[PDB]
Amino acid sequence: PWELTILHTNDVHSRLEQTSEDSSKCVDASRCMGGVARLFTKVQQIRRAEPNVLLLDAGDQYQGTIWFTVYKGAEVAHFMNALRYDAMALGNHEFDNGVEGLIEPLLKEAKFPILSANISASGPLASQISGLYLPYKVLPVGDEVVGIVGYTSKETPFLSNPGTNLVFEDEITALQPEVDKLKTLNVNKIIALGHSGFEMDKLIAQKVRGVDVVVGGHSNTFLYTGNPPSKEVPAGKYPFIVTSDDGRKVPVVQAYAFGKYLGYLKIEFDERGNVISSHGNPILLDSSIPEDPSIKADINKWRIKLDDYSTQELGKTIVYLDGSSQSCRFRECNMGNLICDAMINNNLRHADEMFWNHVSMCILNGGGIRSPIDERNDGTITWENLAAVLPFGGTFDLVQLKGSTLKKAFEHSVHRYGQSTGEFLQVGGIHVVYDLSRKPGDRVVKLDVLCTSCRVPSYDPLKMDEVYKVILPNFLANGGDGFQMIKDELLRHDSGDQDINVVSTYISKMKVIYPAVEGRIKFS
Amino acid sequence: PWELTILHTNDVHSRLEQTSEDSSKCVDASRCMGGVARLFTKVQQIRRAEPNVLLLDAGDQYQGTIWFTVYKGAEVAHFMNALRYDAMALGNHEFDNGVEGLIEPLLKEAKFPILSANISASGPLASQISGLYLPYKVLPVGDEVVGIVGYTSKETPFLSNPGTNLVFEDEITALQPEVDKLKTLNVNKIIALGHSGFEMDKLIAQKVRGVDVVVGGHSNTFLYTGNPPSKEVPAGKYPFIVTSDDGRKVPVVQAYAFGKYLGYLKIEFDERGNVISSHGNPILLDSSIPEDPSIKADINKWRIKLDDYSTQELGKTIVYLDGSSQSCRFRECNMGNLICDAMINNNLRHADEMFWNHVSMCILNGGGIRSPIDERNDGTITWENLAAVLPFGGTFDLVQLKGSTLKKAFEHSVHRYGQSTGEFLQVGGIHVVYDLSRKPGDRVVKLDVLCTSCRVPSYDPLKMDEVYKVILPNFLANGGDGFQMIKDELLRHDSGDQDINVVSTYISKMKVIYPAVEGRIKFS
Ligand SMILES: [Ca+2]
Ligand SMILES: [Ca+2]
Ligand SMILES: [Zn+2]
Ligand SMILES: [Zn+2]
Ligand SMILES: [Zn+2]
Ligand SMILES: [Zn+2]
């Protein structure tokens, strides 16, 4: 039997530096986790021990910290090249800076193949991008070869900025003919590496004949066999076994997000390329693994421009930005309005005749707003200032919620009003009126929402049975501040851009901001 | 006696081409008026006949048409140089593109002195601008000399974009020592040429000892002796005689605006430079005066780039821009919200600790909105498109109104609701609620306005006795659409930027717009 060790990362999301256990900024260095220097140490160790190793990334290196804001993917090429990745699939966030922001910094500088079989280009872009990403690559491993076939979320147009010159095809449709073609080229060991989420990964393992292993991402899925080593709760065993339509057992793996774990799967293959066995587990990259000194010194050299950037003027405010708790946990606050307006601006996606924009609505817990910004520094706003407002290292995510769920959230928002609790909601594209004299759970007396399926945006009453797209902090999507109803009832969730970066980009675009308190939230 | 002919213009406001009688676009060429080609013919005729002539401009050549949008003052230098102006005073609108937009295109290219005695600079700007404008110039006229001493509105910081490196001093304070100095230099014939408005011009004639003549502007004041030749109604005789503190009669002149008239004043001086007599009248530049063929051909050559510019993309809308009458004469319309938001953005002026901005409020009659803009041309918006929405050639002016006056305006807005009349008001920084079941004059049931004297903008009830700054179309300032109360009760009025240009600049700055109907106007 021929044994392959697959090492894999996904959804690293700009966590170049080691992080806290929750993937936010490292504060107590002695307990920090992840980062590329630590990953380098672990990968190097494994490569000393195991003859046949592949190191794969399932996409979404782009977007997540000030590293991506400043270096715009140059950091991803540089540090993935330094760790000698063997292949990467394109993720949705690889399109955040458009096609031009993918071609240059990443496709032109990577020393490893970048893969997606279900993305096609037309017109002059097709010539410009031809060959810079591939449907698959056949890689030599020892005296054998392994085919790696890539895929990217069909939903990428709603979740990034790929432009109107790329088409994202159904994954299974696109993959099958490529996997069949590899068989004709005497390639009997095939890995599907891609970025569509655990549910689609299971469908690909079931339906794409010839796929031996699926290495996925997007959904930040944690899988583990045994007692978990940290706070993440497994969604299933590692690997997750799918029974294929052809009767085979096909392992499906993912490794959470944020570079906290290195996925590690050992596969035994027979001579015909059938999987005989699979076993492994993600490895927690904790402080018991030393950061590689050479990688750490280069990280520290690259950090200098980040530190300089953090104190530069992004734009100006002519108004006090009221992020005080006394305001934002009790009533509409202009900092809340600013952040929700930035959230909706970040989620403007491709023009379509059925909606002016796919999403119009935003909620933001007042407990997520942790500082005001004074306008009396010549109006200046810096990244440092925004990091005090939004200190938790989160994302502004896209969810689908029934109106009933959103009514429950707004009831929760005021269920114990008056104690300066974090659940009070700031909003955009929503007009709410409370009557605090009513019983808890029955305090929402008006709730109107901005249409999407309309050429002129206007407010209509919320419909309990209708599904709404909402932009909200990942903390709330995950049921933080008691919003268990959002976690338990949401119909779709896709992780969005870094919180600070969403606001910084909006401020830079607007140049001079002056958010008002305007009646989005009223009391009767 | 030594006789001087003073020819003067003021507040030409980018009317390079001949115009309709109301200073809008020329449609029936055979009845059009003004324009620089026609002015050239008249000035040339007078200079053939009169030995001692000065041609003076009292400021505000900048701002008013697509000529200024495209050429940014290069057109003013070129065509004022072609008409051989002898001197110009700086107006407030000469600061619309900041100091840099005055230095280059106008101060560096004019072949005549540009004057203001009451503007001082500090820091490195003082070195950069030194000598490029002057407090006064002594000009040879025949065998005599005439001193021309300039001045500019003290209010210019509120009415343009001069920046924080220029100080506008009290006019009379600044002028007196310069006029005294000219006396010491044996200059006994002194013209004060400046841009502060008729009321200040009368104070300068009264109080500045040694001033022989005041040539003013800013207030678009029409003065005439006898039957007026067109539709403008005189504010007084031409010249307006002020009795000075020293006992002299001092003529004050102005010549309306828009290049429709050439001011013409004949002065007789004795040997000591005392005015013995003054008489004249503005000359209507109507179609009985031919356009100079050479100037007209150069105007037609320069028009080519204007025509090309008019169809270029300014920005994009992802929403239908609903400027239909069926919407904007009956209810809040998103085109109205867009235009009022552009009006407030245009009037963001220098940061101060007593207000986030000096003005927060906007009204716009629905009768002034004359087209929608469809978003289905790839979202494109062009200047041509905006000219269909705003076809009348107006300005968005700054006024001061008691709250009582504004309540009367909002009552007027709905006094005969339901007939698709033009008086219905679109708004910004104002939230109004009507109850149409109430009697006409008593239909406004809530009227809240955005604070200015506040660090966080928020809405408070309108106060009947408080004075509010409001941005509104000059049509309304002049009592159009039945708003006689605005005309009769306003406390201050300053003419603002070209309507189309205000919206085009906002669209360009924003790049992608998506104005909503959001509850600024409600019915109960
Ligand atoms: Ca196989
Ligand atoms: Ca004199
Ligand atoms: Zn991701
Ligand atoms: Zn993803
Ligand atoms: Zn003017
Ligand atoms: Zn003026």
Curated annotation (Swiss-Prot), chains A, B:
Location in the cell: Cell membrane
A single Gene Ontology CC term: extracellular exosome
Residue numbers binding IMP: R329, N365, R370, F392, F475, D481
A single GO BP: adenosine biosynthetic process
Positions with a binding annotation for Zn(2+) 2: D11, D60, N92, H195, H218
Glycan attachment points: D28, D286, D308, D378
Binding site for Zn(2+) 1: D11, H13, D60
Cysteine disulfide partners in this protein: C26-C32, C328-C333, C340-C362, C451-C454
Membrane topology: Lipid-anchor; GPI-anchor
Gene: NT5E
Full protein name: 5'-nucleotidase
Catalytic activity: a ribonucleoside 5'-phosphate + H2O = a ribonucleoside + phosphate; a 2'-deoxyribonucleoside 5'-phosphate + H2O = a 2'-deoxyribonucleoside + phosphate; dTMP + H2O = thymidine + phosphate; CMP + H2O = cytidine + phosphate
A Pfam family assignment: 5_nucleotid_C
UniProt EC number: 3.1.3.35, 3.1.3.5, 3.1.3.89, 3.1.3.91
